[PDB]
Design a protein around this ligand. Structure first.
Ligand code: SF4
Ligand code: SF4
Ligand code: FES
Ligand code: K
Ligand code: ZN
Lengths: 48, 114, 125, 94, 206, 85, 688
């Protein structure tokens, strides 16, 4: 890279990270989608 | 309605092979409980053998009975020859399976299945 | 040498299926409807057998669709509805058969687009 | 475009966030919620609209065969810009 | 034509002639004879003919199919006899291959071909294991590929892909146990067939 | 006592012919006499004709009308209309 | 005798004269490729994909439009035919955009697939492509018109099926564009069908956009419940979520169309759902609870009441299995107050005779009628697929249609006789000239809208309309087996409830206000707490929190029509069943199972434990309810008309005015479509 440097992009990490497994920086998986079904919320005033 | 037989030509002939298989299984349980160091009693093992035989009591096709005996003898051979391990023998007893609900109300409370 | 066997063919005891997935299932025997998004009719030639849909739930970790139904993906293909019914009968599944729906023959006439006195005349081409 | 919910969890670019009563956020306790901070919707918006002289322009996303399939964008409407369906670049007929 | 597989008419003619030859000599058993467009000869026989037909092809001076390349089954549920038994044979003398096919259902035994080819021993065990076809007079018929005590015949078209049970280690009983299968992600069924016919040459009459 | 009458019959089977005669001749007069009683007539092809009576608290009886004549149908109707099972 | 012999690749086939070349190929199982041809639209002949060689003829013919001649041999696989297909496909793809990855049609595209099967495998087009600007035609149909191949299917469908002449072509040659020219929205109750018939991704569903690919969807064949037509549908699901609704072809019901409410209201199933049992807490507010606790509270009250103190109302979307289960449960406490929200006059025969409340002619029978008299109905919005059948007979059979009621736009021209109910007497008396049309007619059809029977004088209107149909049958002008009298229902659950012996309307409840009321998906607000004693115990069972739920003491979450296998009977009396596409959300349960579970806890166990057993029960009450897809005839119109004359009732002076006069009134009619955000967008679009 001192002779053929990589192409620069604004989104490329400026700071490389090594393997973070076993540390508080480890990746934890989760679902990235929002709730699919909306439940009906009952009214907040008595009226039976 | 004219088919090739497997071993038996009628139910009486087939029912003989069933009885011979039952005796073989009956006499093998004590050695199975000892060889595999099972924690079940000999009575439990025989009670399990009888239960396995009884759920097939409604069969009236000799060819189906012949295959059940054929498969039952393979299972016995696997056991007597210790091809099975302890896990395989105890799989008949479903020890880690919790009791599923049988009545309508219990099934209704837990899920949608019939 | 052959023998005589008059009992109805029944193999439920030698197929290895657990009891739950024999008695409590409902097989549907049908010819799939044409996908309305396409005009091709080649997926409507054969009879199919599928089973009743059971619960799918969200996996707590990733949100993937989990299932406990071993038959959820099973789909068999048959030449005729007799073959499908025969298969369902010997496996002990209760079933529903829906009669094949064939598009009824239409009367087409390009000339009607320009009728002298009928409503079939088209206002645009 | 990362913002934090009232409970402090970062919201993803897909809008995902565990709500206040969700037990599932226990998975981040002692660890972290991985969130990418380069929101593409924000980055594409910064790109200037490209002024062209023709009614129809083509976009392949740049880089020739390293971009996307080449598509042609009609620029007759004057109210809005033409937007590439693959890469989001915008065009306008001067 | 660079992209088209060339035809071989000489081999097609030779195989067709031998197919009629076999059909003339064992009419008692031969039901159908066909040669494919890529020149593979198939003999379809009544299941009673397994031993006579295989013996003839192994031993006859104009056949000498001394090697059993493969023996397998195919499950076709729409057929009354759902299992198609396929023997693939090789003749080193005449540098030729032939395929013999018969059929059976769930309850009809097929005669074991171990007397003709010792190679058939394990192939028949595999067919029994994976399809449940019983071979009569086998020296030792039992499962070969599946776990001990495994129920069912997985290669049948109606056996579910992931099966009915799955295994895990249970600490309470200190052993591996089997339990009904639950999948964190269900296998996703895809409907891929195009609604437009691809091959007119194989169109079935309506 | 009585809460609901139901009559099942086929539209064309000869076994339902008597029920068909009863409906076309006597049902209208029956309905006039029992103005506030549900008499659910339900035709279905190839079904054996039947007479269902429902009493208080969901008790039901069913009488077969197969091959009955219009008179027997009348008789069966009178038996149900005088019961309190 | 009439048939002529033609040959398809040498195979003889006998066809009626006028059969096209394409149709003759169908007869031997050969499907000619096509784009512009649709068998339910007028022939166009413009795409040229159907060109086929005729043996000994130098010129290929357009198979879709060319009538087959005697002795012709149609070569469907000849070199000339194949090269013709390759050439046409090459032209179709020359300007087509490289959009497949971003285009929703991908994977179920007739352009893709016929390119794969009949086109070349490469391009020799070296120029730049056409690009066309997009048209906004409303919130339902997205347009990406650069994909349009100018097949004119959408134009023909709009003009012929929908009866709306807003789509057309502007310009000429390669610049010819499909659209409305001006800025106009294509808002029709059948508009969404142009998505299906557009062979390419030029017209696509806005709600569905980008969410799924065809190969990954599971298809569940079901039935629509948004009206009483009983349209057959396919519910596409993926990984446990309903993705979209598609028509399913049924020649005798909806053909291959569905209404926009049937197509797009499914997104209401994801909103305002009831997922847990709820009971009122000490402060009078609904709070989540277990099934055990919720049913114990309901069972306690049920055991403490009898007879007229217990009543039930069934809503519009309720299935037959639940209807009989609730009827059985209330009968076991000697309660017979099983009511529906939709009224049907009980005067005379009432619900004793099916023919009194059925569309006896059937939907397909409209095509055989010669005069249709519509009374007090707007079938365009009450039964869109039924109105489409009327227009089809109007278009092809020259059917004469007359209306009594508000002069709504029906998409075809009709004779407006007026909105006064008094016209029925004039026609029956013979003074009115239109009565002479009915006498001359051989197969007249008289249709009374159920929405008209919701008036206070519904019994009088039903009697008056029946009197007309009885005069027609007394005049001997009709065949004999042809049925004249018809009732056009608008509620999916109505006919099954009448079949089971429910009381139509909530009049019985208003006479004897019960102490315990069951609301089974009853969201019409017919009975509110003002009409009930101060302490009335209200149990709501349903799938949506809408009108009934907020007033209830106990909420039992039920299943929607996509989440159960349930029996619905359409306006003709045809029983059909849905299938489970996805299971009910949360703790919701199948509706008949809830009632069966409640019966056990209340010490009154119902005698059925499975879907098959409760369907055996339905057969005992009304045998037709288990004859799926069958239309069982109903007789005894003469006996019904006699009882109809026994009691005299006066027509009110009010004009007949249907509940839905314009498209804005069509989109929201039930709890599912009221919760649908797509339906709200449609309402906003057509009003603003
Ligand atoms: S319409 Fe068909 S061919 Fe055209 S971009 Fe869409 S998927 Fe591809
Ligand atoms: S928009 Fe679709 S249906 Fe209409 S002309 Fe274009 S391709 Fe045909
Ligand atoms: S399908 Fe015949 S020209 Fe278009
Ligand atoms: K489309
Ligand atoms: Zn781009």
């Amino acid at each position: 890279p001192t002779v053929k440097p990589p192409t620069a992009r604004k989104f490329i990490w400026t700071n490389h990270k090594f393997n973070l497994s076993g540390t508080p920086q480890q990746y934890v998986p989760y679902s990235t989608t929002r709730k699919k079904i909306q439940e009906w919320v009952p009214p907040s005033t008595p009226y039976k | 309605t004219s088919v090739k037989p497997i071993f038996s030509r009628d139910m009486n002939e087939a029912k003989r092979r069933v009885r011979e298989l039952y005796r073989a299984w009956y006499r093998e349980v004590p050695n199975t409980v000892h060889l595999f160091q099972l924690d079940i009693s000999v009575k439990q093992g025989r009670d399990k053998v009888r239960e396995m035989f009884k759920k097939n009591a409604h069969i009236t096709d000799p060819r189906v009975v012949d295959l059940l005996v054929i498969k039952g003898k393979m299972e016995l051979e696997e056991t007597i020859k210790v091809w099975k391990q302890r896990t395989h023998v105890m799989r008949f007893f479903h020890e880690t399976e919790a009791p599923r609900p049988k009545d309508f109300l219990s099934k209704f409370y837990v899920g949608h299945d019939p | 040498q052959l023998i005589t066997v008059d009992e109805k063919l029944d193999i439920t005891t030698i197929t290895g299926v657990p009891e739950e997935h024999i008695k409590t299932r409902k097989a549907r025997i049908f010819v799939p409807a044409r996908n309305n998004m396409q005009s091709g009719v080649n997926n409507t030639k054969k009879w199919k057998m599928e089973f009743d849909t059971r619960e799918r739930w969200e996996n707590p970790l990733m949100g993937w669709a989990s299932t406990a139904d071993p038959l959820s993906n099973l789909v068999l293909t048959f030449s005729t509805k007799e073959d499908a019914v025969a298969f369902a009968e010997k496996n002990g599944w209760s079933y529903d058969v829906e009669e094949r729906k064939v598009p009824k023959p239409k009367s087409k006439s390009y000339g009607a687009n320009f009728s002298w006195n009928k409503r079939t005349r088209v206002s645009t081409k | 475009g990362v913002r934090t919910s009232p409970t402090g969890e970062k919201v993803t670019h897909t809008g995902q966030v565990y709500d206040d009563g969700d037990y599932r956020k226990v998975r981040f306790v002692g660890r972290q919620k991985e969130v990418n901070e380069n929101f593409a919707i924000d980055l594409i918006a910064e790109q200037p609209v490209s002024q062209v002289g023709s009614r129809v322009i083509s976009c392949d996303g740049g880089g020739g065969a390293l971009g996307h399939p080449r598509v042609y964008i009609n620029l007759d409407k004057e109210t809005k810009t033409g937007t590439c369906g693959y890469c989001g670049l915008q065009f306008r007929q001067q | 034509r660079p992209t088209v597989r060339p035809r071989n008419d000489v081999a097609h003619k030779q195989l067709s002639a031998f197919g009629e030859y076999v059909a003339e000599i064992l009419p008692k058993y031969v039901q159908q004879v066909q040669v494919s467009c890529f020149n593979e000869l198939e003999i379809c026989i009544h299941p009673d003919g397994v031993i006579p037909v295989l013996t003839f092809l192994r031993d006859h001076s104009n056949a000498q199919f001394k090697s059993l390349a493969d023996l397998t089954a195919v499950d076709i549920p729409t057929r009354q006899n759902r299992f198609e038994i396929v023997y693939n044979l090789l003749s080193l003398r005449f540098n030729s291959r032939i395929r013999v096919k018969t059929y059976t259902d769930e309850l009809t035994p097929i005669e074991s071909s171990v007397p003709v080819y010792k190679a058939a021993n394990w192939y028949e065990r595999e067919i029994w294991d994976m399809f449940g076809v019983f071979f009569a007079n086998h020296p030792d018929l039992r499962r070969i590929l599946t776990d001990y005590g495994f129920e069912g015949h997985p290669f049948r078209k109606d056996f579910p892909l992931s099966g009915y049970v799955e295994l895990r280690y249970d600490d309470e009983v200190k052993r591996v146990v089997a339990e009904p299968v639950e999948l964190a992600q269900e296998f996703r069924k895809f409907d891929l067939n195009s609604p437009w016919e691809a091959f007119p040459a194989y169109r079935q009459p309506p | 006592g009585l809460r609901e009458i139901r009559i099942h019959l086929c539209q064309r089977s000869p076994g339902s012919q008597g029920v068909r005669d009863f409906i076309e001749k006597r049902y209208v007069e029956l309905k006039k006499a029992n103005p506030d009683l549900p008499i659910l007539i339900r035709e279905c092809s190839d079904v054996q004709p039947k007479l269902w009576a429902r009493y208080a608290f969901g008790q039901e009886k069913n009488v077969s009308l197969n091959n009955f004549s219009a008179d027997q149908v009348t008789r069966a109707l009178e038996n149900v209309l005088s019961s309190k099972a | 005798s009439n048939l002529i012999e033609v040959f398809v690749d040498g195979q003889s086939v006998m066809v009626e004269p006028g059969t096209t070349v394409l149709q003759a190929c169908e007869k031997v199982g050969m499907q000619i490729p096509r784009f512009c041809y649709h068998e339910r639209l007028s022939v166009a002949g413009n795409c040229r994909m159907c060109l086929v060689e005729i043996e000994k003829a130098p010129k290929v013919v357009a198979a879709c439009a060319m009538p087959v001649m005697k002795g012709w041999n149609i070569l469907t696989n000849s070199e000339k035919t194949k090269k013709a297909r390759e050439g046409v496909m090459e032209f179709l793809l020359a300007n087509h955009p490289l959009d497949c990855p971003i285009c929703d049609q991908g994977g179920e595209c007739d352009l893709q697939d016929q390119s794969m099967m009949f086109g070349s495998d490469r391009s020799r087009f070296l120029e730049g492509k056409r690009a066309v600007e997009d048209k906004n035609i409303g919130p339902l149909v997205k347009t990406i018109m650069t994909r349009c191949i100018q097949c004119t299917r959408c134009i023909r469908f709009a003009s012929e099926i929908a009866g709306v002449d807003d789509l057309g072509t502007t310009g000429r040659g390669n610049d010819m564009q499909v659209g409305t020219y001006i800025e106009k929205m294509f808002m029709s109750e059948l508009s969404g069908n142009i998505i299906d018939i557009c062979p390419v991704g030029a017209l696509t569903s806005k709600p569905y956009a980008f969410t799924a690919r065809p190969w990954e969807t599971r298809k569940t064949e079901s039935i629509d419940v948004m009206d009483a037509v009983g349209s057959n549908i396919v519910v596409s699901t993926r990984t446990g979520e309903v993705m979209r609704i598609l028509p399913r072809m049924h020649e005798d019901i909806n053909e291959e169309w569905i209404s926009d409410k049937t197509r797009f209201a499914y997104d209401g199933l994801k909103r305002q759902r009831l997922t847990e049992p709820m009971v009122r807490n000490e402060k009078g507010l609904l709070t989540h609870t277990t099934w055990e606790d919720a049913l114990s509270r309901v069972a306690g009250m049920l055991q403490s009441f009898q007879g007229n103190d217990v009543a039930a109302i069934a809503g519009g979307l309720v299935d037959a299995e639940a209807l009989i289960a609730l009827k059985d449960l209330l009968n076991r406490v000697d309660s017979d107050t099983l009511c529906t929200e939709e009224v049907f006059p009980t005067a005379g025969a009432g619900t004793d005779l099916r023919s009194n409340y059925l569309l006896n002619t059937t939907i397909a029978g409209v095509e055989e009628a010669d005069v249709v008299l519509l009374v007090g109905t707007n079938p365009r919005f009450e039964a869109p697929l039924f109105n489409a059948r009327i227009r089809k007979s109007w278009l092809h059979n020259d059917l004469k249609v007359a209306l009594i009621g508000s002069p709504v736009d029906l998409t075809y021209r009709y004779d407006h006789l007026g909105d006064s109910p008094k016209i029925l007497q004039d026609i029956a008396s013979g003074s009115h000239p239109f009565s002479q049309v009915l006498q001359e007619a051989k197969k007249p059809m008289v249709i009374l809208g159920s929405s008209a029977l919701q008036r206070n004088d519904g019994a009088a209107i039903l009697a008056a309309v029946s009197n007309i149909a009885q005069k027609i049958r007394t005049s001997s002008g009709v065949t004999g087996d042809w049925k004249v009298m018809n009732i056009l229902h608008r509620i999916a659950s109505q006919v099954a409830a009448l079949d089971l012996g429910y009381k139509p309307g909530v009049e019985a409840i208003q006479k004897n206000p019960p102490k315990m009321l069951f609301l089974l998906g009853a969201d019409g607000g017919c009975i509110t707490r003002q009409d009930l004693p101060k302490d009335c115990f209200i149990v709501y069972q349903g799938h949506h929190g809408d009108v009934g739920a907020p007033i209830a003491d106990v909420i039992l979450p039920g299943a929607a029509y996509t989440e159960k296998s349930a029996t619905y009977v359409n306006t003709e009396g045809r029983a059909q069943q849905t299938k489970v596409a996805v299971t009910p959300p949360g703790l919701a349960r199948e509706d008949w199972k809830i009632i069966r579970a409640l019966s056990e806890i209340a010490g009154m166990t119902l005698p059925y434990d499975t879907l098959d057993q409760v369907r055996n029960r339905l057969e005992e009450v009304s045998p037709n309810l288990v004859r799926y897809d069958d239309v069982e005839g109903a007789n005894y119109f003469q006996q019904a008309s006699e009882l109809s004359k026994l009691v005299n009732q006066q027509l009110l002076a009010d004009p007949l005015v249907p509940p839905q006069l314009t498209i804005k009134d069509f989109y929201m009619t039930d709890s599912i479509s009221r919760a649908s955000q797509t339906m709200a967008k449609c309402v906003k679009a057509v009003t603003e």
